[PDB]
Amino acid sequence: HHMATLKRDKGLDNTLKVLKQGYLYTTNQRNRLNTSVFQTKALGGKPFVVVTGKEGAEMFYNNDVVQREGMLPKRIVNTLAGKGAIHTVDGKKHVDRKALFMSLMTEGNLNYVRELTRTLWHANTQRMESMDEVNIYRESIVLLTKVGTRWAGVQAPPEDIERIATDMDIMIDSFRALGGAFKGYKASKEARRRVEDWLEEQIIETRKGNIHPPEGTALYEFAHWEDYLGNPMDSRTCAIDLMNTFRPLIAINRFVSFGLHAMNENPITREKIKSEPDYAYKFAQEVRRYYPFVPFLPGKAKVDIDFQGVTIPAGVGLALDVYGTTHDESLWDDPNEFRPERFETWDGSPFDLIPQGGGDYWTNHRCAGEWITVIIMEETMKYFAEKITYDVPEQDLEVDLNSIPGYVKSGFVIKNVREVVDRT
Ligand code: HEM
Ligand SMILES: CCCCCCCCCCCCCCCCCCCC(=O)O
């Protein structure tokens, strides 16, 4: 019957086309097919209906019609999320375990991550002054490894931090093939196993009473948690989900690199981060909206869904267009311009600013760490804008929108770092 016909990016499998157009694939198809919703096949002939905008996001997060079970590509589960991770469960089991993740996001725990971040950048100033150049992508990922492990209650000796950061970096990057085979797949599984082994030891030692992580940290709460049926997570699964509490915190290094990129590109933002109290928040929010990170999210239609003039058939894949929604003309005035001032009148909808998911924290798969992400970016941008001066030598600053994942090609390099001190 009874709806209009669902247009298609025709082909048995368009994975290579998706990979070559990257974050602009869905926009290109919508413009080429002149439509707001279309079907494409990928990952070996699997049909996906691409939905976007607020309506797309509110439908994608309707648990009565959309299923997330088994839709993350297996290789991404094996490298990025981990087997049996929170991302891979649905229903009461998911709601129960998600409440554990959300219980970490207290006012005091959020204030703690803010202070850790501020202290570590302040302490890092001398080191960056001594370096001839500083790759911000790499320097922030090492610093955030120190922040994240400590916030999670996980003991990481300083001699192991560079190793851990590198292993996290590999796992975070491992969605690049969208679940297809790729050269660094085994290196990614090996990195994950090293980190999993390390965390599982900490959980076991916590449960044995050999170490005593502080109450309220991820290590403590996860090791002692029981699900709604009375059963604790087995040690390996516990280690996996414990990693889910701070690996993505370490992934904030992507947004730190982007934030300095934005500051360099919009020079006046530096002064306003210094002088306007709310501005650091708005700049952080506009970095998350504007720069590419998560391209889209996979789901599956549980039943026929009537959506934007078409019928989405039961059993077809669904792809929530993350990049397309955060750059949706009709949601954001001049969406391809960096404009932190737009967040002066953003009404806080759960369904437009979705760079880390949409919907409800407690009953949807929406990112648990959005507050931490904003807090860490606020403090990091405040540091770079206010506590130090530096030079940006010319280098490859391109963010290739046709290449997933989004990166500044150089990683954003700075030189001539010097503390700002009033010694008068
Ligand atoms: C650094 C940038 C970050 C990005 C781009 C990001 C993005 C995402 C996305 C797209 C999802 C999936 C949403 C869905 O499936 O509907 C997700 C889930 C999740 N994120 Fe993040 N996130 C980030 C930071 C964080 C941080 C800092 C934490 C923890 C402190 C975190 C913890 C999680 C968890 C636990 C989930 C799974 C929740 C569930 O399945 O119910 N993330 N994130
Ligand atoms: C056109 C649609 C094609 C459909 C293919 C669906 C393939 C799904 C790819 C999903 C990519 C997930 C990216 C998640 C990034 C996670 C944020 C980093 C934080 C972390 O370490 O967890």
Author numbering: -1 to 422
Provide the authors' own sentences about this structure as they appear in the paper.
The importance of Phe79 in its interactions with His85 and in regulating active site structure and catalytic activity were explored by characterization of F79A, F79W, and F79Y variants. Crystals were obtained for both the H85Q and F79A mutant P450s in complex with arachidic acid substrate, as well as for the WT OleTJE in conditions containing formate. Structures for these mutant enzymes were determined to 1.44 Å (WT/formate), 1.80 Å (H85Q/arachidic acid) and 1.95 Å (F79A/arachidic acid). Arachidic acid substrate is bound similarly in both the H85Q and F79A mutants as was previously reported for the WT OleTJE. In contrast, for both OleTJE H85Q/F79A mutant structures, a sixth ligand water molecule is clearly visible. UV-visible substrate binding data for the H85Q/F79A mutants indicate much smaller HS shifts than observed for WT OleTJE, consistent with retention of the aqua-ligated LS state in the major fraction of the mutant P450s in the crystal structures. The F79A OleTJE mutant exhibited decreased activity compared with the WT and H85Q enzymes for all fatty acids tested. The alkenes are the major products with F79A OleTJE and all substrates, with the 3-hydroxylated fatty acid formed in excess over 2-hydroxyated fatty acids for the C10-C18 substrates. Mutations to OleTJE Phe79 also diminish substrate-dependent heme HS conversion and weaken affinity for shorter chain (C10:0-C16:0) fatty acid substrates. This translates into much lower product formation for the F79Y/W mutants from these substrates, although F79A OleTJE is less severely affected, with between 36 and 85% overall product formation compared with that of WT OleTJE for C10:0-C20:0 substrates. Crystal structure data for the H85Q and F79A mutants reveal only minor alterations to OleTJE active site structure, suggesting that quite subtle changes in the positions of active site amino acids, water molecule(s), and the substrate carboxylate region may be sufficient to trigger catalysis when H2O2 binds to initiate compound 0 formation.
